[PDB]
Amino acid sequence: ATCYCRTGRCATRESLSGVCEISGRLYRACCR
């Protein structure tokens, strides 16, 4: 299971699977 931290919406056929912190900011995990 490959997963990304993404500043925008998930790529789709990609599910939002958690969150991630980069530089004081939350963003979407997206796993495919």
Side-chain angles (χ1 to χ4, degrees):
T2 305
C3 297
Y4 316 80
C5 197
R6 289 211 175 263
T7 47
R9 275 158 80 253
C10 287
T12 70
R13 295 275 288 213
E14 256 189 22
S15 74
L16 170 60
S17 296
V19 300
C20 35
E21 286 151 63
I22 302 173
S23 150
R25 228 75 87 196
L26 259 102
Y27 307 105
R28 295 183 178 76
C30 311
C31 300
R32 72 184 188 170

Short mmCIF file of all heavy atoms in Angstrom, two decimals:
data_model
loop_
_atom_site.label_atom_id
_atom_site.label_comp_id
_atom_site.label_asym_id
_atom_site.label_seq_id
_atom_site.Cartn_x
_atom_site.Cartn_y
_atom_site.Cartn_z
N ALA A 1 0.88 -1.19 0.00
CA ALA A 1 0.00 0.00 0.00
C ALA A 1 0.89 1.20 0.00
O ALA A 1 1.59 1.43 0.97
CB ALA A 1 -0.89 0.02 1.23
N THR A 2 0.88 1.93 -1.11
CA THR A 2 1.63 3.16 -1.22
C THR A 2 0.68 4.29 -0.84
O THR A 2 -0.48 4.31 -1.30
CB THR A 2 2.15 3.36 -2.67
OG1 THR A 2 2.92 2.22 -3.08
CG2 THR A 2 3.02 4.64 -2.78
N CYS A 3 1.21 5.25 -0.06
CA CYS A 3 0.44 6.39 0.49
C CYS A 3 1.15 7.71 0.34
O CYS A 3 2.34 7.78 0.54
CB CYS A 3 0.21 6.20 1.98
SG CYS A 3 -0.79 4.77 2.35
N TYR A 4 0.41 8.78 0.07
CA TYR A 4 1.01 10.11 -0.11
C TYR A 4 0.46 11.15 0.86
O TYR A 4 -0.67 11.09 1.29
CB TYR A 4 0.81 10.61 -1.54
CG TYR A 4 1.07 9.55 -2.62
CD1 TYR A 4 0.09 8.59 -2.94
CD2 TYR A 4 2.27 9.52 -3.30
CE1 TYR A 4 0.31 7.63 -3.90
CE2 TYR A 4 2.51 8.57 -4.28
CZ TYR A 4 1.54 7.61 -4.59
OH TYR A 4 1.78 6.63 -5.60
N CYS A 5 1.29 12.11 1.21
CA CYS A 5 0.82 13.36 1.78
C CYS A 5 0.63 14.32 0.59
O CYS A 5 1.50 14.44 -0.27
CB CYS A 5 1.86 13.88 2.78
SG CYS A 5 1.29 15.14 3.96
N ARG A 6 -0.53 14.98 0.52
CA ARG A 6 -0.94 15.77 -0.64
C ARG A 6 -1.50 17.11 -0.19
O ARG A 6 -2.31 17.17 0.71
CB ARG A 6 -2.07 15.06 -1.39
CG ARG A 6 -1.65 13.82 -2.14
CD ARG A 6 -2.48 13.57 -3.38
NE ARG A 6 -1.92 12.43 -4.10
CZ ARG A 6 -1.09 12.52 -5.13
NH1 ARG A 6 -0.75 13.72 -5.62
NH2 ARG A 6 -0.60 11.42 -5.69
N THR A 7 -1.09 18.20 -0.81
CA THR A 7 -1.60 19.49 -0.36
C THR A 7 -3.08 19.69 -0.79
O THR A 7 -3.80 20.46 -0.16
CB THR A 7 -0.70 20.69 -0.75
OG1 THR A 7 -0.32 20.60 -2.13
CG2 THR A 7 0.56 20.73 0.11
N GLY A 8 -3.54 18.97 -1.82
CA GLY A 8 -4.87 19.16 -2.38
C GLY A 8 -5.66 17.90 -2.17
O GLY A 8 -5.25 17.03 -1.43
N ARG A 9 -6.82 17.79 -2.80
CA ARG A 9 -7.62 16.57 -2.76
C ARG A 9 -6.83 15.39 -3.23
O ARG A 9 -5.87 15.54 -3.98
CB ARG A 9 -8.84 16.72 -3.66
CG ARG A 9 -10.02 17.40 -3.00
CD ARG A 9 -10.91 17.96 -4.07
NE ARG A 9 -11.78 16.96 -4.68
CZ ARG A 9 -11.62 16.46 -5.90
NH1 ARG A 9 -10.58 16.84 -6.66
NH2 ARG A 9 -12.50 15.58 -6.39
N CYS A 10 -7.23 14.20 -2.79
CA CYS A 10 -6.56 12.96 -3.17
C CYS A 10 -6.76 12.67 -4.67
O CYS A 10 -7.79 13.04 -5.26
CB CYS A 10 -7.08 11.80 -2.31
SG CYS A 10 -6.54 11.77 -0.57
N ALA A 11 -5.80 11.96 -5.26
CA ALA A 11 -5.79 11.70 -6.71
C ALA A 11 -7.02 10.97 -7.28
O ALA A 11 -7.31 11.13 -8.46
CB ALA A 11 -4.49 11.03 -7.14
N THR A 12 -7.72 10.23 -6.41
CA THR A 12 -8.99 9.52 -6.68
C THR A 12 -8.80 8.17 -7.38
O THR A 12 -7.91 7.98 -8.23
CB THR A 12 -10.13 10.38 -7.32
OG1 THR A 12 -9.80 10.73 -8.69
CG2 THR A 12 -10.49 11.64 -6.42
N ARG A 13 -9.67 7.22 -7.00
CA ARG A 13 -9.26 5.82 -6.94
C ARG A 13 -8.12 5.74 -5.93
O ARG A 13 -7.43 4.75 -5.83
CB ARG A 13 -8.81 5.33 -8.30
CG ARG A 13 -9.94 5.30 -9.32
CD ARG A 13 -10.72 4.02 -9.21
NE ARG A 13 -9.92 2.92 -9.72
CZ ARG A 13 -10.44 1.87 -10.34
NH1 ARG A 13 -11.76 1.79 -10.52
NH2 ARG A 13 -9.65 0.90 -10.78
N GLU A 14 -7.94 6.85 -5.21
CA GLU A 14 -7.08 7.00 -4.04
C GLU A 14 -8.00 7.33 -2.89
O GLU A 14 -8.83 8.22 -3.01
CB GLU A 14 -6.12 8.17 -4.25
CG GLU A 14 -4.70 7.75 -4.58
CD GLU A 14 -3.72 8.92 -4.58
OE1 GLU A 14 -3.99 9.98 -3.93
OE2 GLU A 14 -2.66 8.74 -5.23
N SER A 15 -7.88 6.61 -1.78
CA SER A 15 -8.79 6.82 -0.66
C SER A 15 -8.08 7.67 0.37
O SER A 15 -6.87 7.52 0.53
CB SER A 15 -9.18 5.50 -0.03
OG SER A 15 -8.11 4.98 0.74
N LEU A 16 -8.82 8.57 1.04
CA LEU A 16 -8.26 9.42 2.11
C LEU A 16 -8.10 8.53 3.33
O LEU A 16 -9.05 7.98 3.83
CB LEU A 16 -9.18 10.62 2.36
CG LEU A 16 -9.04 11.57 3.53
CD1 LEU A 16 -7.71 12.29 3.57
CD2 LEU A 16 -10.15 12.59 3.49
N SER A 17 -6.87 8.30 3.75
CA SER A 17 -6.59 7.20 4.69
C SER A 17 -6.02 7.67 6.01
O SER A 17 -5.79 6.88 6.89
CB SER A 17 -5.62 6.19 4.06
OG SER A 17 -6.21 5.58 2.94
N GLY A 18 -5.73 8.95 6.11
CA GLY A 18 -5.28 9.55 7.38
C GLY A 18 -4.92 10.98 7.10
O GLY A 18 -5.51 11.60 6.17
N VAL A 19 -3.94 11.49 7.84
CA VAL A 19 -3.47 12.89 7.69
C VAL A 19 -1.97 12.96 7.84
O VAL A 19 -1.34 12.01 8.30
CB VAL A 19 -4.12 13.85 8.74
CG1 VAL A 19 -5.63 13.86 8.62
CG2 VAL A 19 -3.69 13.52 10.17
N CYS A 20 -1.36 14.07 7.46
CA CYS A 20 0.07 14.23 7.75
C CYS A 20 0.41 15.67 8.01
O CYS A 20 -0.22 16.55 7.43
CB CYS A 20 0.88 13.72 6.58
SG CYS A 20 -0.06 14.13 5.12
N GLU A 21 1.39 15.88 8.88
CA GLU A 21 1.89 17.16 9.30
C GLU A 21 3.19 17.45 8.56
O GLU A 21 4.16 16.70 8.63
CB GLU A 21 2.17 17.16 10.81
CG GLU A 21 0.93 17.21 11.71
CD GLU A 21 1.12 16.55 13.07
OE1 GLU A 21 1.98 17.00 13.87
OE2 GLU A 21 0.39 15.57 13.34
N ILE A 22 3.18 18.57 7.85
CA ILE A 22 4.38 19.15 7.29
C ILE A 22 4.34 20.65 7.59
O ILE A 22 3.35 21.32 7.29
CB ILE A 22 4.45 18.96 5.77
CG1 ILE A 22 4.40 17.46 5.42
CG2 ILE A 22 5.68 19.66 5.21
CD1 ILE A 22 4.30 17.16 3.93
N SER A 23 5.41 21.14 8.22
CA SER A 23 5.62 22.55 8.51
C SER A 23 4.38 23.22 9.11
O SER A 23 3.86 24.23 8.61
CB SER A 23 6.13 23.24 7.23
OG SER A 23 5.74 24.59 7.16
N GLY A 24 3.90 22.64 10.20
CA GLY A 24 2.79 23.20 10.98
C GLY A 24 1.43 23.05 10.34
O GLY A 24 0.47 23.68 10.77
N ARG A 25 1.33 22.23 9.30
CA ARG A 25 0.12 22.24 8.52
C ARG A 25 -0.34 20.81 8.39
O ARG A 25 0.49 19.93 8.28
CB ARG A 25 0.38 22.86 7.16
CG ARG A 25 -0.64 23.90 6.74
CD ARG A 25 -0.48 25.22 7.48
NE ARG A 25 0.47 26.13 6.84
CZ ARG A 25 1.03 27.21 7.42
NH1 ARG A 25 0.78 27.52 8.71
NH2 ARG A 25 1.88 27.96 6.72
N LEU A 26 -1.64 20.59 8.47
CA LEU A 26 -2.21 19.29 8.13
C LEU A 26 -2.52 19.24 6.65
O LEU A 26 -2.87 20.28 6.05
CB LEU A 26 -3.47 19.01 8.94
CG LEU A 26 -3.19 18.07 10.10
CD1 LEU A 26 -3.11 18.79 11.43
CD2 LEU A 26 -4.31 17.07 10.12
N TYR A 27 -2.37 18.04 6.10
CA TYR A 27 -2.81 17.67 4.74
C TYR A 27 -3.35 16.22 4.68
O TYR A 27 -3.32 15.45 5.69
CB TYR A 27 -1.67 17.84 3.72
CG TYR A 27 -1.06 19.21 3.76
CD1 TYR A 27 0.18 19.41 4.33
CD2 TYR A 27 -1.76 20.32 3.23
CE1 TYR A 27 0.74 20.68 4.38
CE2 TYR A 27 -1.24 21.59 3.29
CZ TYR A 27 0.01 21.78 3.86
OH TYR A 27 0.55 23.04 3.91
N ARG A 28 -3.80 15.84 3.49
CA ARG A 28 -4.47 14.58 3.30
C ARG A 28 -3.46 13.47 3.11
O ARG A 28 -2.31 13.72 2.75
CB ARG A 28 -5.36 14.67 2.08
CG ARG A 28 -6.50 15.64 2.26
CD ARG A 28 -7.35 15.59 1.03
NE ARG A 28 -8.51 16.47 1.13
CZ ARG A 28 -8.49 17.80 1.01
NH1 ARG A 28 -7.35 18.49 0.83
NH2 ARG A 28 -9.64 18.47 1.08
N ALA A 29 -3.61 12.34 3.97
CA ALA A 29 -3.10 11.13 3.34
C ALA A 29 -4.20 10.58 2.41
O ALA A 29 -5.28 10.13 2.79
CB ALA A 29 -2.74 10.13 4.43
N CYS A 30 -3.60 9.98 1.41
CA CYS A 30 -4.17 9.35 0.21
C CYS A 30 -3.37 8.11 0.00
O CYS A 30 -2.15 8.21 -0.16
CB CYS A 30 -3.98 10.28 -0.98
SG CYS A 30 -4.51 11.95 -0.59
N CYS A 31 -4.01 6.96 0.04
CA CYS A 31 -3.35 5.72 -0.27
C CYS A 31 -4.04 5.13 -1.46
O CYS A 31 -5.24 5.36 -1.67
CB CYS A 31 -3.46 4.76 0.87
SG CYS A 31 -2.72 5.43 2.36
N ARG A 32 -3.25 4.40 -2.25
CA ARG A 32 -3.74 3.69 -3.42
C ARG A 32 -3.41 2.24 -3.19
O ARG A 32 -4.11 1.36 -3.68
CB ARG A 32 -3.08 4.20 -4.72
CG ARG A 32 -1.62 3.82 -4.93
CD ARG A 32 -1.02 4.44 -6.18
NE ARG A 32 0.32 3.90 -6.43
CZ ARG A 32 1.04 4.09 -7.53
NH1 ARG A 32 0.58 4.84 -8.52
NH2 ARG A 32 2.24 3.53 -7.65
#
